[PDB]
Design a protein around this nucleic acid. Structure first.
Length: 245
RNA sequence: UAGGGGCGAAAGACCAAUCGAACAGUCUAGUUGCUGGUUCCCUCCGAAAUGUCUAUCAGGACAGCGCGCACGCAGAGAGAAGCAAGGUAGAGCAUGGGCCGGUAUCCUUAAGGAGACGGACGAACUGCGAAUGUGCUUUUCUUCUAUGCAAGCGUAGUGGGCGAGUUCUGGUAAGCAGGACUGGCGAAGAGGAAUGAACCUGGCACUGUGCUAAGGAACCCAAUGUCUGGACAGAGACCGAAAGA
RNA sequence: CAUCUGCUCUGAAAAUUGAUGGCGCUUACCAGACAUCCGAUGCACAGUUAGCAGGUAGGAGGGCGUGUGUCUACUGGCGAAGGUACCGAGUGAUCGGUGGUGGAGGUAGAUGCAGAGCAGAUCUUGGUGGUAGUAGCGAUAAUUUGUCUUCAGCGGCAAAGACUGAGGAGGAGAAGGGUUUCUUCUCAUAAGAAGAGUGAGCCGGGUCUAAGCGAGUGUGUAGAAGCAUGAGCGAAGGAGAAACAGGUUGAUAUUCCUGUGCCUGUGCUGUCGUACGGCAACGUGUAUUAGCUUGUCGACACGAACAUCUAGACAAAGCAGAAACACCUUUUCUGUUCAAGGGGAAAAAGACCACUGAGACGGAUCAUCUGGCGACGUGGUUUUAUAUCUGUGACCAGGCCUGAGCCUGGUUUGUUGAGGAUGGUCGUCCAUGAAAAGACAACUAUAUGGCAGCACAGUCCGUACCAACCGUAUCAGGACUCCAAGGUGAAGAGCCUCUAGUGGAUGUUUUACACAUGUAAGGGAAUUCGGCAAAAUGGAUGCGUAACUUCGGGAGAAGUAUUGGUUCAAUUGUGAACUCAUUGUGACAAGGGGAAUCUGACUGUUUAGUAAAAACAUAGCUUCAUGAAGAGAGAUGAAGUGAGUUCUGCCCGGUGCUCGGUCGUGACACGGAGGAAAUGCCAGAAAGCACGGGUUAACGGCGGGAGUAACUAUGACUCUCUUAAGGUAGCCAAACGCCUCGUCAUUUAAAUGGUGACGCGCAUGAAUGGAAUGACGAGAUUCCCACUGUCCCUACAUGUAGACUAGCGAACCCAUUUCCAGGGGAACGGGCCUGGACGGCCAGCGGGGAAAGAAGACCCUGUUGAGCUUGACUCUAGUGUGGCCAAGUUGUGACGAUUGAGGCGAGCGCCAUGAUCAUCACGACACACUUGUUUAAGGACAAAGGCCAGAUGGGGAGUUUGGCUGGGGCGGUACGACCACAGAAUCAGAACGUGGUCGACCGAAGGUACUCACAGCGAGACGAGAACACUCGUGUAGAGCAUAAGGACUAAAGAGUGCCUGAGUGUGAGCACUACUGCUUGCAUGAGGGGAAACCCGGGCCUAGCGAUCCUACGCAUACGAGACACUUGUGGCGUGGGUGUCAGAAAAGUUACCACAGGGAUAACUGGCUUGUGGCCGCCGAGCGUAGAAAGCGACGCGGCUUUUUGAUUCUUCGAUGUCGGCUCUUCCUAGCAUGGCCAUGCAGCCGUGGCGAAGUGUUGGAUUGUUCACCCACUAACAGGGAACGUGAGCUGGGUUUAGACCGUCGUGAGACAGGUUAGUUUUAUCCUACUGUCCAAACAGUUGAAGGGAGUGUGGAUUAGUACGAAAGGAAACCCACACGUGACCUCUGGUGCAGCGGGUGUGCGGAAGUGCAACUGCCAUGCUACGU
RNA sequence: UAAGGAGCGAAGGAGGGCUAGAUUAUUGAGCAGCGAGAGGUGAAAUUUGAUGACCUGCUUAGGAGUAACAGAGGCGAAAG
């Protein structure tokens, strides 16, 4: 047969375009700074708003981008790095923040610029500090617990734009605007409605799959469709998670 | 974004009147056990549609039947006369299978059974047995025979057949399917059955005079009349049963 | 009288008209005989001749002709070759001469070399016919008259008549074209030839940057591709310094000329400058370069309402000129202009500054709103149009003259108003709506800078025209944009007009059949698969509006009434009166409505060119995988179901996916033992596999049999088999039910239909999603109201073609000689044989030419393909897993490998610890390697490369998927062997002919020598019986012989008993159609067997139990071995084993309804032919039955025929094509007689019937369900018989069924896919030829006639009278003449319907100044003549 | 007014809403010790344990609750 939809959309001419982008998002590199928030802006592909910051490096003014936490305003002064106060919207070394606190834009290793929590409405929880090894345990929004060194930086607050998934998209055109900038195929034609030249689920005198939909992790790429390496299937209840800090 | 690739609100849709794999050009005069065609005259000879093996059944090869060149040469698609083998037609029912009825007598019953016998029968019953056909010897056995036979060598076509008379098997039968024997049409014209591949007479270089065949002889149409019996039905010359006055 | 033989007779019925061959024959027949004649390519005689003589496929011998070579002989201007008429020679292929034409070359003989002879190939190229002066040439607005040319153009010009109608058939640009544009001449004409024509600082290109492309360099590659970075490039419609009026040419113009300007720079001469004002909001002053830095401009979505301006359009008055006047009118028409640049208001809308000090309150918008972070008020500051003036006069209208110049006007007011411009507000979004070049301000330094005059400069390329573009063209198609008047009306709708633009194949009143349209008595879907098509409804205003519902909707529900003109009131609500001959959204424009069911939620999308859908999409719902990112779990990808409401039961046995451990297996490397060494051997061994768990909103799956309740039925209850679990809740003859047209109710006169119920449901059912509704479908289906030419049943009229005529002018197709009936024939003839008939012409028509299209698409065959699937065969990319490979450095412990000095148990193995090399975790440093944490972080790990080895692998690649066969498939095996039967008494001998057997078994069931029988039957012998052991007599096999069938065997070949391993070893010859195989037989040998010996034995009493080349295993002796020699491996020879059952021997699964190619009537799906089982119809006999009684009527059990209208059986004709079911329409034939006419019998009183005979003239209907033929009901009737003609009839129609490609359901399949199972959507081409048929002319002067031959026509019902009669116990109950009607036939318009071309009238919208006369769009009342039936 | 409503003074109650804290207990994980059974009942089986249960230490993570004092005691319109 021919090449499936899933492979074609991974070729280079289909990658997302950057022509409307504001810049690369991430923290400054300097040990200490005082910054001012210049503007709060929407960026074409992203639902969380961005804040433009201004800080001096040598004598010269320089500009950066952060993801906005909820409760900043244009004109606010913010303090970055060691010796910053625990005030909403400051950036601090993680070892300085008390247990049970909520944080965003956490660095996985020092000076990486911030990864981890970046989507609207999300946060992470500080669950443990180890005074020997200088590690800290953070609980991520998937439920995963990960350990990071005390020298990493983090932003104090919750990411702006929460609640967005409460309102249903009642019409086809509303879905159109949401997926127009994403990589997923919309509208999505079902594999059982294709001919066998186009998809492993195609063909036959009734619409059916005909073979089990759970497939191996090591299966060849042009036929790896369906539920890939599923441990279980169906709507029944699972089992207890195992937890360590 | 480009061909075993694209693109698809999915129809195998669309990608320059081309898409269940584009166009241009080359390899390439790709291959073909299958269809079509294959160019002058006269003379002489003249088939086969069967057997064995084949991923064989619309094809091959080997053998059998033609022709050419021919070393050589007592032979013959016919009879007699001695001699073998055969189990069909007819005939029979003696081992085996198998239908109906029995006198005297016998056994029991007071029923039935057996029976000295008669009638009816078999592709896989036989005690007897033809005609026709087959083989052996003898030219020291009639009759024919050189314009004849012919080892050997080289090489062709053929390997869908069909029909008549006599017979057979399967089938209600069939211008049906399948065998055997002797001549045909295939590859055969001419005269006759009004017409007809195969039926009757009878086998063809080219002319002329006579005669016959088969079939005809009022007229169409070359040749026709006679004698004796039957027969009356718009009958017969061409044409159907059991049953009948 | 009874039998038998001959001829006649009865049994004896088929579809166009018919066949002893015809006409005829009764003395042309049947049977028995007789005469002699006619008749072959045969026979006789005679010529010619080698004479011996037919011939396909095929084979051989001798000759004729063509282009060129070598030689010999000749020839041509006193006319060569060629070509054309005649004449001679040869059996023939061919050859020779004569007369005209032609104008320079040509042969005869013998040999040599070949591109060496045509009727055909749907042959190749070129040229020409018939058809044929024919088919056609005419969609759109429309044309007439005069006059000149033209020389014969509806060409030009005047006057009329029309049309596009400002979302134009008008005026311009772009893409595309490229001289098509202008002048002259000529026809050569959508034709040529010769010239001429496009002028810029201010218009556009050359500039900037979007999405993006990229030279070079780095890395890579055999070279490439690719990847990282990046000079340069990327918009004639995005950003982008500065121009406008009026004139002029045959053709250019914001480009030329005149006038008035502007931008960017340069230079001269004058003339001034180095600062101030306001509480402030800010002003006055035309101001230099340069630089940091901060900001602004360039610089931006959609939608709605409200202001203001400008084009435009109206109406009054003034003047100037036009139109109209039988009448009337100060009625009607055209005009009334002002650019860029300069100067400049009031106004409206917002910002802001000073004073002031406000509320349970003031201000303010069409709408939101607004104020102590300062309201109202009073005075100011600033930003954004426009009117008006100047632009020095141009331009327009009119008058007077004129081959030129003068003169006069261009004045005032009101209403409205964009489809253009601008301003400040408001709404929407999980969508927030480009960059850069180039500018400007503030701040800091620095200063000869501003203005006026005059002068200079600004390169290069494009510039004509389009109705001329792409479709083979002068093609009804396609193709990016701009400007836009008046009336009617909501409206750049339709209809009518102004500005501007427009047109030719000719004449004829022109039948039939058409194509676009009108109208119709009475009836109203009766029509048809189906209301398909048409009709009906229609705008605005008011009254009045149901079920159900997600509460939004349904809803314009439905149902009803009103509407013109005039003259008034009243001011947006509307009222009232008067008036008209059909009435008023008058033309144009403009919904039919209701009740239910199946199905998809909705708007949206799709097979360009047969499918618009129930299919796809969609919002919502659920599952899966991941902490990797230029992205970071409210994320990023993969699947399934299909909005909302309400539910979503049970199963982890199989298959898959996933998790955990090894107990076993499982590669290469790395080790070990041995040997002179190679080859082998042993260990070792990840992941996988196996094993144990999880998982169905994963693939999917979800039962049988018996009994049992006070009538019968049914079974809550019991028992029994069975499993992974035995279909829960719901729903149903449903788009899913075979039987099936299921049963009951309702709808109709009548229901294969619809709806409601019921349910052991062939084969319903739960995100392979189940069930109940709303709103919305060009979706499928049933019914009702309105409405109608769909129909009964057709008639009349209009336009355009068509017929005839002038001008112009083709194609398909074609072996052609073409009237029928029967016969035969390749089984349906135009042509052949025997009969019936025989002409040409013009216009129509569709019976035939199995008419033309196109090497049948269905079906089979080919050792021909391609797309797609998987549990087919053999490989492969990707993904995982192991060991090894760039000398990192140094610590600690550990297991392991190798050998000593210790200890235990009757020097052994076992237990202690001490030295020698690798080596697995763990630490701590920095040097390889990694990362924009980069003057940095990690770190010998990772990540990325390389060489070998295992695992997985329809993601892909190649290929295969036997044969015979009463077509193929499914089934069997007639595919290798053996016996019997038949195949007309040797042997042989076919069919999916008949009855069967084989793929082995046995140390004896083999070899030998000797002994004796057997199966039964008749007597005996205790228990002991039907049947126990023992005896005597008979006993030709009635028994046995392992295993089919046949043959064979008696002191044995059978049953016993003894001994043996001949079921030896070498090597020959033969038989069965004879290779393999099986058997028969010769000679030589054994320290061979059995027997006294003669004799016998190298398997089974005989006929069946089996297999090549190459490779490999074993036995046997004799060989070979590379320069030489020794050994371990190897190679030769003979013979046996390991195996091919498709058995004279390849290594192999499906599907195509998406399909291709070569062929086949060697072979299926129609018709025809042969047959007639089965279907239908008729005879013979007489057992019984009929109230008696064979036979009025019947007729068992048996027996003989006919028919082709049923279905089989067979495969002769057609696969380079004979259009396939039913209906509609129309004609003819048959009889086996339903009605109607004449008769005979009766169990015939009469009435009504029943059985038969001669007879085919005239009849045999309207409907409901269904695609039906068929069936079954209702209504009528004299009666509602049965059939044929290529299952009559598609260049006659229709297209409901079946049978291409889309899609749903059930059952089957792992799947692609299947299903004489159900459902819905699905392109019907061409006559102009010949012949037939229908009419028309000629053959046939004119007037009057004749009648050969051909055609043919009237059929039936009722009433009255006989008559309440005959006849019958009664009840009942018949038989001419006359009159009324229906159907059919032929005519006719006096009457009555219908139609409206000629004729008279009326109104609506808009044109010609009014009235009168009238155009266009079309509407409407009456109606001559004519034609017609619903009339006579 | 030994009818009602407004108000003053000192005091009492598990009456109600909110904010910030608490002693144990029951489960779950981590690590350490030990080396065979634990659980449950009238009596037992499903079941769990050498991948170390049970029991004893130390760490942690959550979400409920307020024992004994506590009564013919108190409060509220009742539910509480």
């Amino acid at each position: 047969g021919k090449v499936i939809r899933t492979l074609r959309l991974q070729k280079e001419h289909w990658k997302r375009k950057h022509h409307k982008s504001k810049g690369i998002v991430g923290f400054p590199t300097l040990k200490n700074c005082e910054a001012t928030v210049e503007k709060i802006v929407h960026e074409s592909g992203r639902p969380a708003p961005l804040a433009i910051i201004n800080y001096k490096k040598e004598e010269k003014n320089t500009k950066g981008l952060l993801v906005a936490i909820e409760g900043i305003y244009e004109g606010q002064k913010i303090q970055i790095g060691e010796n910053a106060s625990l005030e909403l919207g400051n950036v601090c070394p993680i070892k300085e923040i008390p247990e049970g606190s909520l944080v965003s834009m956490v660095e996985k290793k020092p000076k990486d610029g911030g990864k981890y929590v970046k989507s609207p409405g999300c946060y992470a929880t500080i669950v443990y500090h180890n005074k020997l090894t200088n590690q800290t345990t953070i609980k991520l929004p998937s439920g995963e617990r990960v350990r990071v060194t005390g020298e990493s930086r983090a932003l104090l607050g919750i990411i702006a734009g929460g609640g967005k998934d409460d309102k249903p998209l009642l019409k086809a055109v509303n879905a159109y605007y949401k997926y127009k900038t994403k990589g997923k195929p919309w509208p999505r034609v079902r594999g059982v409605a294709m001919n066998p030249v186009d998809h492993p689920h195609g063909g036959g005198n009734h619409q059916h799959v005909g073979h089990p939909t759970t497939v191996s992790r090591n299966a060849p790429v042009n036929g790896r469709v369906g539920l890939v390496a599923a441990r279980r299937t169906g709507r029944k209840k699972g089992s207890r998670k195992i937890t360590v800090n």
